[PDB]
């Protein structure tokens, strides 16, 4: 009771507050709205060791947004995107919150989407993050199994089709993984196919796939229990103006004791290795 973990309370507070925030109305020429909060990573603890209630929470937030902007023909062009802030803390200032705003399948007609949310959506998130600390210090001041889900958004410098076939080509998969075991004679991955990776630690299973659109795998690590089988979904969002792809990864079914280990393993063995072998973006 001396220390109170409030990561779930912070997740619920963010899912209650960040949702419904709109930059205007649904009938405006330029409109945006946070659909839901994708991921809340980090830690949110309240300690009473110093005698006074303190909160040293270190959190990173990522949300998804949907809206519509103007076009040259007079019609409203919809757009889906993501907004991720890498740091919200107790000592962060109102103007210190850096908002990484990105638009999936970005086009020239969507160029007005970025400044709009920068003028009417950012201050609301800023004041919400500012009030989060005071609500946390005022609330908790006085004295199969359970799985979780994470969200990743790596940016690759590669066309959607190229990366899609790279995630399926058995030879190229063995190239960028350096250790692969396929149990089917087929040259490429097909529906309902299992294969082993990374010295037996990784056992994945392609469940569903869409042409250059979606890839669903049943990822599972060898140390996990038998009923714990995670499901990872990768969505391609290649752009048309700047021509960049952003592999939106929704990773559910992860045990409560590996949600961090699965993250650093992906940014190194699934993002960095591909960018080093095939060179799909500068990385070090």
């Amino acid at each position: 009771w001396v220390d109170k973990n409030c990561i779930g309370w912070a997740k619920e507070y963010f899912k209650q507050k960040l949702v419904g925030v709109e930059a205007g109305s649904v009938k405006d020429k330029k409109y945006a709205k946070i659909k839901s909060v994708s991921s809340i990573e980090g830690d949110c603890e309240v300690n009473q060791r110093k005698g006074k209630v303190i909160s040293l929470f270190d959190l990173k937030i990522t949300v998804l947004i949907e809206g519509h902007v103007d076009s040259k023909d007079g019609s409203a062009l919809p757009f889906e995107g993501s907004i991720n802030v890498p740091e919200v803390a107790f000592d962060s200032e109102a103007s210190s919150y850096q908002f990484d705003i990105s638009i999936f399948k970005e086009t020239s007609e969507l160029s007005e989407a970025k400044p709009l949310i920068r003028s009417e959506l950012l201050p609301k998130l800023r004041q919400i993050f500012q009030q989060f600390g005071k609500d946390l210090l005022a609330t908790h001041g006085n004295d199969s199994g359970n799985s979780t889900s994470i969200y990743l958004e790596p940016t690759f410098n590669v066309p959607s089709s190229e990366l899609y076939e790279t995630f399926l080509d058995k030879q190229r998969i063995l190239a960028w993984t350096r250790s692969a075991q396929f149990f089917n004679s087929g040259p490429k991955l097909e529906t309902k196919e299992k294969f082993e990776l990374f010295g037996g630690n990784v056992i994945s299973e392609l469940v569903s796939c869409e042409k250059d659109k979606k890839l669903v795998f049943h990822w599972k690590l060898k140390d996990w229990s038998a009923p714990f089988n995670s499901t990872i979904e990768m969505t391609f969002h290649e752009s048309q103006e700047f021509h960049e792809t952003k592999l939106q990864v929704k990773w559910t079914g992860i045990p409560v004791g590996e949600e961090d280990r699965v993250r650093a393993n992906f940014e190194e063995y699934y993002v960095r290795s591909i960018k080093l072998t095939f060179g799909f973006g500068a990385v070090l």
């Binding site: 830690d43 110093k50 006074k52 303190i54 040293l56 270190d58 802030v85 890498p86 740091e87 803390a89 000592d91 850096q98 990484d100 020239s108 970025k114 400044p115 920068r118 410098n157 590669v158 066309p159 190229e162 190229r172 190239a175 700047f242 021509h243 960049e244 792809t245 080093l276 072998t277 095939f278 060179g279 799909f280 973006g281 500068a282 070090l284």
Partner: protein
């Protein structure tokens, strides 16, 4: 009494110099000093030193002698603190004293905890503030940049919450700043009202980009273009992607330059006349380029090679192809896609258009000249040839026909 426990306003410069000479083996005066203190419910006093040059002496290389020392309740802990400061920022020196660090059982080791990460973020943000304070003094900022440009670029490439903050410390040359290193803020303040993109170009050196043909058109519109000389600045530019609402555009890659409606009409009525020439160039170049397009991003250059988007740059391809451990079996081919850009206001392109209008699109001389033009475009763009023997033979043929040799 230790130095970090005193008020910085009551500490002289000679005291900081003596502290640096005691904690560091360097004999030169530290370029900058930063003594700050954070209060509230968590307290730590940190004195950070910025050397005048890179501290790459390393008399005990491969052994951990980290620069930032940690103190818990005025007690020294160890010299193996690695995660206390990022590796890209691991060039400054100094000490930090706190009292809330969750040490090990014996209080001689600190690892695998989150209470140190917040102090690390405080250290890096205070170092950003110190660098901004250094930026006010140009004479010291020149030395700081010429010493840690690679470090600041790696920090822009690595960090995310401080990427936009560290982007203000970047100093590069440009077409209008050939004499002094200009900043991104000085670029956007000097940017015209109608320009919406920060244009930059990379190269092996300043001499290669000072006459690059990708600038002339952007100089016709009086658009300033940044110059990149190191192979590491691209790593930061592909992570920034924008600055103050102005996105970064690499002119060596494929991009769009907006023009007026009358210009659009004059260009669409002129491209339609070069369709057979573009088709001939495309079907004679094969799969070497994705498409041959009549480009208006050049004025006097007959043709150039523009690396298609989703790929690398010229200097980026050059720095990536020279890596032995990157690819040894030809597995990476992302940067193989290119575009053959031609300028219709060049006499060579007009002669080729007249030739293909005469019907000699499949002539051996026209094919040889188009292949030589593609090769010299690859050359002037910054790409190595697949086989210099064909280029050498074509050059020798041109020389022989110039010296009246039949």
């Amino acid at each position: 009494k230790p130095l970090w426990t005193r008020n910085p306003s009551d500490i002289t410069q000679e005291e900081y110099n003596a502290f640096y000479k005691s904690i560091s083996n360097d004999w030169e005066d530290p370029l900058y000093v930063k003594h700050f203190s954070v209060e509230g419910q968590l307290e730590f006093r940190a004195i950070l030193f910025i050397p005048k040059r890179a501290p790459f002496d390393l008399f005990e290389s491969k052994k951990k002698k980290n620069n930032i020392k940690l103190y818990v309740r005025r007690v020294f802990i160890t010299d193996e603190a690695e995660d206390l400061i990022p590796e890209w920022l691991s060039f400054v020196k100094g000490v930090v004293d706190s009292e809330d660090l969750p040490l090990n059982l014996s209080r001689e080791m600190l690892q695998q905890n989150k209470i140190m990460k917040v102090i690390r973020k405080n250290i890096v943000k205070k170092l950003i503030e110190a660098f901004n304070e250094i930026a006010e003094d140009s004479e010291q900022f020149d030395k700081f940049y010429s010493a840690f440009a690679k470090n600041i670029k790696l920090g822009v490439h690595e960090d995310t919450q401080n990427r936009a903050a560290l982007a203000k410390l970047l100093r590069y040359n440009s077409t209008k700043s050939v004499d002094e290193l200009t900043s991104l803020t000085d670029y956007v303040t000097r940017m015209p009202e109608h320009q919406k993109n920060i244009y930059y170009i990379t190269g092996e050196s300043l001499k290669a980009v000072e006459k690059s043909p990708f600038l002339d058109a952007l100089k016709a519109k009086n658009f300033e273009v940044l110059f990149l000389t190191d192979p590491i600045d691209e790593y930061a530019f592909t992570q920034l992607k924008e600055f103050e609402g102005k996105t970064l555009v690499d002119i060596t890659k494929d991009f769009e330059l907006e023009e007026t409606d009358e210009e659009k009409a004059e260009r669409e009525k002129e491209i339609k006349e070069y369709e057979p020439l573009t088709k001939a160039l495309k079907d004679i170049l094969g799969d070497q380029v994705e498409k041959v397009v009549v480009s208006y991003k050049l004025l006097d250059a007959p043709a150039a090679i523009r690396t298609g988007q989703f790929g690398w740059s010229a200097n980026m391809e050059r720095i990536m192809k020279a890596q032995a451990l990157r690819d040894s079996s030809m597995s990476s081919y992302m940067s193989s896609k290119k575009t053959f850009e031609i300028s219709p206001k060049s006499p060579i392109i007009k002669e080729l258009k007249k030739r293909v209008d005469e019907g000699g699109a499949q002539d051996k001389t026209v094919k040889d000249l188009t292949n030589l033009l593609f090769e010299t475009a690859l050359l002037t763009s910054g790409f190595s040839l697949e086989e210099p023997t064909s280029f050498a033979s074509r050059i020798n043929r041109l020389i022989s026909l110039g010296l009246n040799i039949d």
